[PDB]
Amino acid sequence: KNPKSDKFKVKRFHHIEFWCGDATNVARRFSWGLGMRFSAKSDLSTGNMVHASYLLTSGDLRFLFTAPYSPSLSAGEIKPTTTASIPSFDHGSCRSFFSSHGLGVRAVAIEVEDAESAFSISVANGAIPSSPPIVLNEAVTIAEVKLYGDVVLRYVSYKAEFLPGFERVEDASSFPLDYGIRRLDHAVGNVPELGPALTYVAGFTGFHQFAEFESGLNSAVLASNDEMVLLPINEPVHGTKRKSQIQTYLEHNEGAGLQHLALMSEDIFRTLREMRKRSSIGGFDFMPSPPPTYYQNLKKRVGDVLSDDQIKECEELGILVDRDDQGTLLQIFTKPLGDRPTIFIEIIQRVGCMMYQSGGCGGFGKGNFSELFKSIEEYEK
Amino acid sequence: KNPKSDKFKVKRFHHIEFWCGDATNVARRFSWGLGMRFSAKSDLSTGNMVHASYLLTSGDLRFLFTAPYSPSLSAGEIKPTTTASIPSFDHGSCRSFFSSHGLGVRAVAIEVEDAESAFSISVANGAIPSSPPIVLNEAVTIAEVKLYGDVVLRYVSYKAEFLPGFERVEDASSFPLDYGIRRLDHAVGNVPELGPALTYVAGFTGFHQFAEFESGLNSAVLASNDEMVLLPINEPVHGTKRKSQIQTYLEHNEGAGLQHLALMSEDIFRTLREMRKRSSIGGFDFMPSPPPTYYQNLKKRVGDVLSDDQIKECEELGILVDRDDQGTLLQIFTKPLGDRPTIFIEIIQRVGCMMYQSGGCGGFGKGNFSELFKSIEEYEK
Ligand SMILES: Cn1c(=O)n(CC(F)(F)F)c(=O)c2cc([N+](=O)[O-])c(C(=O)C3=C(O)CCCC3=O)cc21
Ligand SMILES: Cn1c(=O)n(CC(F)(F)F)c(=O)c2cc([N+](=O)[O-])c(C(=O)C3=C(O)CCCC3=O)cc21
Ligand SMILES: [Co+2]
Ligand SMILES: [Co+2]
């Protein structure tokens, strides 16, 4: 059931912004680890005395990494005279965010036809304003509302080069890395109580519940009209035998915030080969391997979609596989991206539901919870 | 002239500790960029609820990267019951250091025979105590005094595995990277006024002035008895045509602090080939190239130490070369290690002064200031 209730028109994810203490080191780690090119900068070299911001891109995926400079470099400025390229930026907000959460996502930015209307409609429907709409170089409008915790939903609209004031990175300082990652598929929040969080976000966006088909979670997925923009939210299930991963998140994150980013690959086998190659030389580690019992039940589940060679390839790379009403989902999770057991990344590829591919094809892997529990018992046999 | 006036016995540099906001991302960037292996950890996985600390090693070089967790994980602890592996660590001090300076060096640690005596003698000779001596697991003693700015000089002594409470990193999660870097050669501070800084540090250590043989600097080098431990200090020269790099440092760093770490390589050609290979895929960038006039005057200076093949190799890699009373110095500088124009790294190899090699052999490149100025004029001809 898709009522198509978006209160303003939404296109697609535009970028994800990380708030960090050093944007250079995080951006270079992520670039090597995920195979993303350095494509735009805004910093001292471009006349930005406020923040350093570096953009990495892979296909349509845009990761922005931003950290503050000493406030003393911009003490003479006022908001109208600012040299920040992201006018919503605030030294104290950024410093307070990082000291509270460590490295994490500050803004989930979606592109809209009209960011000012998006902001107005949103707030008129209960969104908590975070930063009012501001027109950038007569070309781009940016506005922010609170999403959950200290994460904001950033609206971006273009009248017609990432953002004004950013410069393209020099050819020599930009290496054409690519491991097959192509776009952001969904962005997931962890909150203490799912009900109020869903009601708030569904309330100001018009996004509808997407619906799926023990685990330490309960969750729901909000989606835009074409279900391209997918924003799931998790809450803990207390009292379970194993402590809820969501509860561990909330404790180490100091409250609600973004849990994982799921990135679509055009070739999850190539992506995981390239990323695993680099795990111990600066890249990302992956979740522990599932038992062989899991991969010895994979043919009886998905053998109609993937060859026995590809199923062996899944056991080598640790890929998990689940099946929807409509399609198949290949998926794997990284270990946390930084010091804290908080944010992590999911790599995915979905097979099926072609019209282009419809969003959410295959679901989010809900069945892998019970399939992994069984193989755990079956292996100890 | 070496009076050998050390007030307590000093052996060698033990480690350099970086204070960061995320220790994972910085440590993985540095590991790939410099070719250093992950060798020890102290973090949640080892029962440290206070800080995450990761040690990288190359030859004798030890870089430690430390960031704080949420204070809430250790709210129930007191100093006697702490789970920190570095008892000098303080959440507020670390958070305040990083927000003030960004990524930078907190501790220059030197090994001594008796860290408690080192601390006592030091303070009795004017050192400002930073953290009193503390015996770790009946095996290791650690103590800290102020060095300059918010940088401390950390004394370490062993009765007889980096530090107690650290664990060796698992074989799979530790990749044998090595680009030829072998040990720390010197660590340089930038201060607003050299005189008072020298008097303070020379005052509590007994270190003697090492002495060398326009530039926006004036500087002096303090050295231990065998001149292995080398601690130069810079101050700005105001009024020069080009603004002093030291003054730019002090403004962006919010005051005095560590400017550069010079790392000895056993093969500076191999090191710079490996590091430059990785500049645009997560590693470190290097200083701009000198003109060819510089390398067209290199034979008439050092042609007795390096072949014309090696001199061509210097022009390819951008290596600079200077000559002492006693030896030859090969050297090159990175661009700053993080967002701010503050800390950077120097790679060096020295040729000569063999007895082992005596410390400081070749100097620190003082002549390259006037050799580079000339080649600049000669190239515009
Ligand atoms: C498939 N799957 C899984 O098998 N396990 C067990 C494993 F593999 F770790 F052992 C997970 O723990 C796991 C955790 C998460 N999560 O979001 O925390 C997700 C996930 O992506 C997801 C969403 O995107 C929105 C709806 C909620 C949801 O579950 C999937 C998971
Ligand atoms: C050799 N040399 C140089 O040629 N230039 C010009 C170039 F190349 F950048 F264009 C420098 O700027 C430069 C800067 C520094 N510094 O410390 O800032 C040092 C250096 O290492 C040093 C010490 O270790 C202790 C004593 C002070 C001192 O000068 C060497 C440099
Ligand atoms: Co997911
Ligand atoms: Co030097």
SS (H, E, C) B324-361: CCCEEEEEEEECCCCCCCCCEEEEEEEEECECCECCCC
B70, B173, B254 member nearest A70 (Cβ)? B254
- Decide whether any atom of ligand 1 lies within 6 Å of the A188 Cβ: yes
Tell me which of A173, A196, A211 is where a domain ends.
A173
Contact B118, B157 (CB under 8 A): yes
> Which ligand 1 atom sits nearest the alpha carbon of residue A216?
12
For chain B, the distance separating the N- and C-terminal CA atoms, rounded to the nearest angstrom, is 43
Tell me which of B173, B202, B225 is where a domain ends.
B173
Burial classification of residue B18, based on how many CB atoms lie within 10 Å of its CB (0-12 exposed, 13-18 middle, 19 or more buried): buried
Asked if B175 and A20 come within 8 Å (Cβ–Cβ), the reply is: no
Together in a domain, A130 and A50: yes
Contact B324, B361 (CB under 8 A): yes
Interface test with B, best of A339, A340, A343, A344 (most B CBs within 10 A): A339
The tally of CA atoms less than 13 A away on the side-chain side of residue B132 is 1
Please tell me the distance from the alpha carbon of residue B169 to that of residue A147, in angstroms, as a whole number. Answer: 38
Q: Is residue A2 assigned to a domain? A: no
Axis crossing angle, helix B115-124 with helix B194-205, rounded to the nearest 10: 130
Asked if A29 and B28 come within 8 Å (Cβ–Cβ), the reply is: yes
Axis crossing angle, helix B308-317 with helix B268-277, rounded to the nearest 10: 30
Question: Of the candidates A4, A33, A22, which has an alpha carbon nearest to the alpha carbon of residue A285?
Answer: A33
Q: Is residue B2 assigned to a domain? A: no
Please tell me the distance from the alpha carbon of residue B157 to that of residue B109, in angstroms, as a whole number. Answer: 10
- Decide whether any atom of ligand 2 lies within 6 Å of the B219 Cβ: yes
Together in a domain, B276 and B365: yes
- Backbone φ and ψ of B349, nearest 5°: -145, 135
Method: X-ray
Burial classification of residue A176, based on how many CB atoms lie within 10 Å of its CB (0-12 exposed, 13-18 middle, 19 or more buried): exposed
Contact A18, A26 (CB under 8 A): yes
- Decide whether any atom of ligand 2 lies within 6 Å of the B234 Cβ: yes
Together in a domain, A138 and A203: no
Q: Is residue A140 assigned to a domain? A: yes
Q: Is residue A5 assigned to a domain? A: no
Question: Of the candidates B29, B350, B308, which has an alpha carbon nearest to the alpha carbon of residue B186?
Answer: B350
- Decide whether any atom of ligand 2 lies within 6 Å of the B48 Cβ: no
Contact A376, A339 (CB under 8 A): no
* Nearest ligand to the CA atom of B220: 2
Interrupted after residues, chain B (C–N over 2.5 Å)? 160, 213, 355
Cα Rg of chain A (Å, integer) = 21
Query: Residues of B comprising the binding site for Fe cation?
Result: 186, 260, 346
Together in a domain, B80 and B32: yes
Question: Of the candidates A228, A290, A234, which has an alpha carbon nearest to the alpha carbon of residue A259?
Answer: A234
Contact A234, A219 (CB under 8 A): yes
Residue A241 tokens read as 């035998």
Q: Cα angle vertex A65, ends A62, A67, to 5°?
A: 160
Interchain CB contacts (distance < 8 Å): A and B: 132
Residues 6+ apart with CB under 8 A from A276: A286, A317
Q: Resolution limit in angstroms? A: 1.9
Together in a domain, B240 and B365: yes
Q: What share of chain B is helix, strand, coil (3-state, %, to 5)?
A: 25, 35, 40
Together in a domain, A227 and A151: no
Whose Cα sits closest to atom 31 in ligand 2? Answer: B365
Residue A132 tokens read as 């009012």
Contact A240, A214 (CB under 8 A): yes
> Which ligand 2 atom sits nearest the alpha carbon of residue B216?
12
Tell me which of B173, B195, B224 is where a domain ends.
B173
Longest pairwise C-alpha distance within chain B: 70
Helices marked H in B233-303: 245-252, 268-277, 292-295, 299-302
CA A247 to chain centre: 20
Query: DSSP readout, A85-113?
Result: SSTT--HHHHHHHHHHHSSEEEEEEEEES
- Give SS3 for A360: coil
Please tell me the distance from the alpha carbon of residue B252 to that of residue A250, in angstroms, as a whole number. Answer: 35
- Give SS3 for B191: coil
Q: Is residue B3 assigned to a domain? A: no
Together in a domain, B96 and B234: no
CATH of the domain at A46: 3.10.180.10
Together in a domain, B36 and B100: yes
Q: What is the span of the domain harbouring residue B50? A: 10-173
Together in a domain, B58 and B135: yes
β-sheet bridge partners, residue B111: B156
Together in a domain, B58 and B123: yes
Q: Is residue B152 assigned to a domain? A: yes
H or E segment to which residue A150 belongs: none
In chain B, the number of structural domains is 2
β-sheet bridge partners, residue A354: A357
Q: Is residue B34 assigned to a domain? A: yes
Query: Residues of A comprising the binding site for Fe cation?
Result: 186, 260, 346
Residue A60 tokens read as 């349509």
Together in a domain, A272 and A167: no
Q: Is residue B4 assigned to a domain? A: no
Whose Cα sits closest to atom 30 in ligand 2? Answer: B365
Chain B residues whose beta carbon lies within 8 Å of the beta carbon of residue A35? none
The residue in chain B having the minimum alpha-carbon distance to the alpha carbon of residue A104 is B22
Asked if B32 and A282 come within 8 Å (Cβ–Cβ), the reply is: yes
Together in a domain, A247 and A322: yes
